[PDB]
């Protein structure tokens, strides 16, 4: 394995922690960024964020924020790459990649926290989890078959990472709107014929959703039925219709 590859790998996956961030930054800066193979390798190593311990993922976002002062193109390519990986992960959707896909979602959330992406990128991604390859009547599909509940884990992962910053102003409204759509998505999954008395919907997924939502919105109404969740969506879409002027 070539020397610069082992060097980059060592800096990002071994040396980098909360206490060495300034030293790793200094070293990354002096890399031969004019060598295209080396620049490509660093980008590729950062997109492959699963190699990094979960609790040090945020250190890679922080390192990238220092680095884009001198090498801005690198940061753009990493963000573009992580978002491509989140999309490809839904197309592939094999359980052996679960840990890697979660690491990518957490990394995107930390990229928002260290100001590498704006909130629009986060909301685009959250809606993609509830709509991409999802039939609009809530029937199962190729990418979202019945016992696949991983979209719910992905959503909760992003919300747990950066959701606390969407509590004032316009981002507050945007999160409130997304949660109305999320609660319907959850009731579509819960309403599938596979779930019975003998084969119940997993209680652990239920608790994941309620813990996430109650942390962000202590007074939120958790819907107790599919009907209630559809009505919330209908009331919200009546508001939209008024704003868009399709009728009035």
């Amino acid at each position: 394995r070539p020397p610069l590859q082992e060097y980059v790998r060592k800096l990002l996956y071994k040396d980098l922690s909360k206490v060495t961030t300034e030293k790793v930054l200094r070293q990354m800066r002096k890399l031969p960024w004019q060598d295209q193979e080396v620049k490509d390798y660093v980008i590729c190593c950062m997109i492959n964020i699963w190699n990094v311990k979960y609790n040090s993922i945020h250190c890679v976002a922080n390192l990238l924020a220092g680095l884009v002062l001198y090498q801005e193109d690198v940061g753009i390519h990493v963000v573009d790459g992580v978002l491509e990986d989140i999309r490809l992960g839904m197309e592939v959707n094999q359980p052996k990649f679960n840990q890697r896909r979660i690491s990518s979602a957490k990394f995107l959330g930390e990229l928002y926290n260290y100001r590498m992406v704006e909130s629009a990128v986060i909301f685009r991604t959250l809606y993609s989890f509830t709509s991409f390859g999802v039939n609009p009547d809530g029937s199962p599909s190729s990418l979202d078959p019945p016992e696949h509940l991983f979209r719910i884990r992905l959503v909760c992962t992003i919300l747990d990472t950066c959701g606390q910053y969407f509590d004032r102003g316009s981002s507050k409204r945007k999160l409130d709107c997304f949660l109305v759509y999320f609660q319907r998505y959850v009731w579509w999954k819960k309403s599938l014929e596979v779930w019975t008395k003998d084969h119940p919907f997993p209680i652990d997924i239920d608790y994941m959703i309620s813990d996430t939502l109650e942390l962000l919105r202590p007074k939120i109404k958790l819907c107790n039925s599919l009907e209630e969740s559809i009505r919330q969506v209908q009331d919200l879409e009546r508001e939209f219709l008024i704003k868009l002027g399709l009728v009035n």
Binding site: D80, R87, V92, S128
Partner: protein, 91 residues
């Protein structure tokens, strides 16, 4: 929104070969090719970003190339996907 991605291209397609398929190319600021950078091996695909100058040219471009079938050496089909990039910042 001016930054457009064309993705799920064959993993051994090159920027130049892609250009031969796309021409005549509309006016653009930026046009770069990416591949071999996923965390989900062996699911390998290639892709590109283009930043268009006018808005009407974007609608034309995806009418033409969304679903356009590229081939690799062995004759496997690769329908491309054309959408706005999820991150709009240009390099």
């Amino acid at each position: 929104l001016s930054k457009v991605v064309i993705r799920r291209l064959p993993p051994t397609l090159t920027k130049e070969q892609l250009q031969e398929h796309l021409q005549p190319m509309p006016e653009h600021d930026y046009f770069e090719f990416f591949s071999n950078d996923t965390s989900l091996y062996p699911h390998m695909y290639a892709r590109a970003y283009i930043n268009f100058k006018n808005q009407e040219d974007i609608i034309l471009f995806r009418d033409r190339f969304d679903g356009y079938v590229f081939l690799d050496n062995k004759g496997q089909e690769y329908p491309a996907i054309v959408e706005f990039a999820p991150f709009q910042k240009a390099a």
